């Protein structure tokens, strides 16, 4: 009589507990610096903050009972200790019998794993507290957080396809918008890199936080270009020409992404390289064809940041902000970047 996702969650945590197992404890104690007490501080901190936000109402989200909060939290903790053990056991240093103290002392990894466990639980129960509610509450940078998602998916095989689909979609949210906000640690990472934005060829062939991020971004945008180039079949020659203008705005106009959506720049790219090329001026016709994509929503092309200071639509964003920046690159097409 339980839902499939809730039943699946039962089978996963069955017989386990919200404390580290004996194997995990052995792995903690083999470290020169034993993480166990710091790991407990973090879960206790996250736990208190979670319950506080869970039980306190806002305009958007009504607060709920503390009994349910503890239930959700206890369940997430159980997942955390199961997944952490699996992660540590399968680690290369573990198999080679090397000290893991450095790996286990990174706070951002433990905070992210615990938040992702909370998100799995909330999703299983079809919580009204919708991502990114959990990382907002816990003060987690999207730019740091998303990295844990791949780890979770590969480290827990008991996750249903639906759980896995959801985790992939919240990763896409981070890549398309959330990691690009003005307060994001992304801009800090770009800054220490001397504002050098990795090109497609460079990360698709580096390997820092920046490169791994842009690798994901470039992969996501290419998939969302391909499908849209299956709308008007275009040609695989032009799908490269359009991928070039989009890469140009990412690398040489990174500010245009700030507080914006990846698809806004990809669509704006589309219309322009069409109009300057033999295959030409495919109109907002592709916007209706953009609606077919899973992540497509009205607010994307209806509501676009201009300056902030009001907020206009995609075509106003384009002619105000975009052409000014992208014209002189695009006009020259009266090189080509490789398409993944």
């Amino acid at each position: 009589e339980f839902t499939q996702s809730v039943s699946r969650l039962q089978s996963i945590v069955a017989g386990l507990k919200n404390a580290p197992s004996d194997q995990l404890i052995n792995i903690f104690e083999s470290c020169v610096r034993n993480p166990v007490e710091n790991i407990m501080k973090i879960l206790k901190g996250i736990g208190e903050t979670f319950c506080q936000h869970y039980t306190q109402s806002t305009d958007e989200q009504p607060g709920s009972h503390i009994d349910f909060a503890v239930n959700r939290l206890k369940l997430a903790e159980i997942l955390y200790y199961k997944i952490l053990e699996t992660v540590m056991v399968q680690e290369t240093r573990r198999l080679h019998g090397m000290d893991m103290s450095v790996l286990l002392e990174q706070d951002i990894f433990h905070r992210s794993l615990m938040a992702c466990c909370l998100e799995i639980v909330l999703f299983a129960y079809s919580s009204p507290r919708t991502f990114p509610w959990i990382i907002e509450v816990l003060n987690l940078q999207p730019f740091y957080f998303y990295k844990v998602i791949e780890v979770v998916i590969r480290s827990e095989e008991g996750l249903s396809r639906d759980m896995v689909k959801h985790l992939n979609s919240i990763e896409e949210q981070i890549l398309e918008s959330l990691a690009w906000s003005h307060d994001s640690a992304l801009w800090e990472a770009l800054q220490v890199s001397a504002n050098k934005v990795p090109t497609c060829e460079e990360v698709i062939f580096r390997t820092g936080s920046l490169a791994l991020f842009y690798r994901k971004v470039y992969h996501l945008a290419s998939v969302r270009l391909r499908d849209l180039c299956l709308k008007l079949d275009v040609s695989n020659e032009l799908r490269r020409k359009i991928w070039t203008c989009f890469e140009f705005t990412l690398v040489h106009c990174p500010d245009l992404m700030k507080d914006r959506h990846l698809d806004q720049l990809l669509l704006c790219a589309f219309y322009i390289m069409a109009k300057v090329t033999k295959e030409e001026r495919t109109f907002q016709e592709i916007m209706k064809s953009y609606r077919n994509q899973p992540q497509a929503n009205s607010h994307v092309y209806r509501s676009v940041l201009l300056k902030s200071e009001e907020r206009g639509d995609l075509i106003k964003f384009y002619n105000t902000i975009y052409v000014g920046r992208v014209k002189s690159f695009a006009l020259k097409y009266d090189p080509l970047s490789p398409f993944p």
Binding site: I315, N319, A330
Partner: peptide
């Protein structure tokens, strides 16, 4: 050259 101004069809209904 270049701006193509237009009106987004008033929507979604």
């Amino acid at each position: 050259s270049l701006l193509s101004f237009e009106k987004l069809d008033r929507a979604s209904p």
